[PDB]
């Protein structure tokens, strides 16, 4: 991603109706760490879900370790809870080469002064002055009155625990709906005039598959024999009708 939010203002985004290369950052090495929780580091493209989330934010390196589905920690319990009703993976890049500078980075205001914890998948941006003491602040800072969201002095010279990281979070959801997202699929090569154990879009059988003299509507995908035995397929990629002998 081009831009990231603070963790408090978690940049929540849902992904739907598409092919998601979930393992892309495992193989590309564009992030320093790729840690998965309930899903595999690789062969992640084999997971089909109804929806996935692909969120983005900037946190400290020690906080990167704290965020995980179902886990506790100051950042996990107060600024954003990542629930365990979902499976997921937390991936992070060292942003000393992007966000850090002398004077700090003011596009990342982290919540420090609170009365309560935020919920699973809950995003917020409030700037209301916080009362630490006994009297109302009414929008004015002072002893026992604080601005709730603040910038960190992230610099190229800080150690890893404090250095900022660009973190992207993958979260996998199942709800009472048809699934709309999965990873890419890989086809094997097509051989026609040989006995083959075939699988076309989930429909299987064993036979010799050659060009058919049948015609079909653009609509249709498979031909059928008695008791719905498949007797023809159209190839999913090649627009040819193939007869199953």
């Amino acid at each position, epitope marked *: 991603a081009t831009r990231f939010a603070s963790v408090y203002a978690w940049n929540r985004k849902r992904i739907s109706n598409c092919v998601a290369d979930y393992s892309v950052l495992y193989n590309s090495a564009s992030f320093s760490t790729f840690k998965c929780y309930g899903v595999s580091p690789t062969k992640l493209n084999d997971l089909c879900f109804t929806n996935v989330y692909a969120d983005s934010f900037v946190i400290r390196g020690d906080e990167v370790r704290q965020i995980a589905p179902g886990q506790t920690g100051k950042i996990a319990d107060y600024n954003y809870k990542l629930p365990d009703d979902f499976t997921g993976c937390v991936i992070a890049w060292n942003s000393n080469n992007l966000d850090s500078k002398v004077g700090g980075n003011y596009n990342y205001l982290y919540r420090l*002064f609170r009365k309560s914890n935020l919920k699973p998948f809950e995003r917020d941006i409030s700037t209301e002055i916080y009362q*630490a003491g006994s009297t109302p602040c009414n929008g004015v800072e*002072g*002893f026992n*009155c*604080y601005f709730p969201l603040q910038s960190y002095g992230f610099q190229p010279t800080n*150690g890893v625990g404090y250095q900022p990281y660009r973190v992207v979070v993958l979260s996998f959801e199942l709800l009472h709906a048809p699934a709309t997202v999965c990873g890419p699929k890989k086809s094997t090569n097509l051989v026609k005039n040989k006995c083959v154990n075939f699988n076309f879009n989930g429909l299987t059988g064993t036979g010799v598959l050659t060009e058919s003299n049948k015609k079909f509507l653009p609509f249709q995908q498979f031909g059928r024999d008695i008791a719905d035995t498949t007797d023809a397929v159209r190839d999913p990629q090649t627009l040819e009708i193939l007869d199953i002998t």
Partner: antibody
Amino acid sequence: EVQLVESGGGLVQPGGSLRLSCAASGFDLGGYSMHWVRQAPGKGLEWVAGIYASGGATAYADSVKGRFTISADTSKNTAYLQMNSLRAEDTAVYYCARSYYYGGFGMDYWGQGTLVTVSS
Amino acid sequence: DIQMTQSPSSLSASVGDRVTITCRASQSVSSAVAWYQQKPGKAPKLLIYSASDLYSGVPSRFSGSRSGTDFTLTISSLQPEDFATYYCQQSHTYPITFGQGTKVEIKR
């Protein structure tokens, strides 16, 4: 590296007073709160007072109200503590320390402190 | 006026051993407690801030976390330079309040 250096320590007669000061170097006072903490021999740390340099607002421990006053000067880049109506009980090393904003953050860097002792 | 309770008042362990010290506030102080080390003749040094964030200049051996309402400091492995009095400071709400200080001894 940042520095804080205490001075103005000394002796006070009972019922008397002493003014302490601390100079900052490597940073401004603006954006920071200057604090004074005392530690009597045999005791732990006791906070006395704090001032927000960019505010002018102050805060005090209940134990020192009516006796201690805190102030700061951003042109000189120094912090001050005025200690009045002192007792033998008030003997302590008085330290200056830095924290951010108006609090909610702990102190990071401390000066080393200067001794003030009260006797007839 | 929020008061501090610490435990143990003293701790004794050998070099390389694991040390845990806890601090409790009488009221909520959120996560704005800081830990300091003090050596005789010296001012306290910030060790850990905002409950669990390690301060630069402090070894990676130091860490900590909140459990229930209490905060725990952990030294994964004591080295000779880690023997000091350990203080907690609550800066969340004024007055800033410090605990007594936990003395950690080196086993001899």
